Amino acid sequence: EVTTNDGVTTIANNLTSTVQVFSDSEYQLPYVLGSAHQGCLPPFPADVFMIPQYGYLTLNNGSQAVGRSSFYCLEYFPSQMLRTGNNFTFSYTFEEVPFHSSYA
């Protein structure tokens, strides 16, 4: 947690603050992934990266909002509070997607 006291940032370690993590494993959300954006894991392993921001687009009549425009509140999902000692794990198994033809 950073304190910019008198123009000097003094980054202080906080121990009781949490971090919410949930994996949207039922697909109630807009799936922004696969739109070829930045903010991935970096190519080279010795790189600190910065996490993207989750925004989503819905239906519009221009820059208006039709009555089908859904709003998704993301604290209305069960997240997982993570202190400085906990960890988030889950597992996933892909479908029987066909092999990518890596031949000519």
Binding site: Y27, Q28, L29, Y31, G67, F71
Partner: protein, 103 residues
């Protein structure tokens, strides 16, 4: 292309027909088939009972959906009902696409 369920083996055609009951034949035998039957018709009841399989929604939409509602107003006649002399009038075509799944 008109919408619906394309079935390879659809519900089978149920065909119905009054059995021809002839009128009085002449006393001598005739080769020609029949030019005179008894005019008749049938009536009766018929029950069709289709069991459907529904797909319950699994949405995490926040704001309310757009759903098919009746017009709440002082109206002259109630929609999808009978009239002053009993004519069932469907006022408008009702689709089925009112809910919102994300793409």
């Amino acid at each position: 292309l008109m919408g619906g369920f394309g079935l390879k083996n659809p519900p089978p055609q149920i065909l119905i027909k009054n059995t021809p009951v002839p009128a009085n034949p002449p006393a001598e035998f005739s080769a020609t088939k029949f030019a005179s039957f008894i005019t008749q018709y049938s009536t009766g009841q018929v029950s069709v009972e289709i069991e459907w399989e529904l797909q319950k929604e699994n949405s995490k939409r926040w704001n309310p959906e757009v759903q098919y509602t009746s017009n709440y107003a002082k109206s002259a006649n109630v929609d999808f009902t009978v009239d002053n002399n009993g004519l069932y009038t469907e006022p408008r075509p009702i689709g089925t696409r009112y809910l919102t799944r994300p793409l």
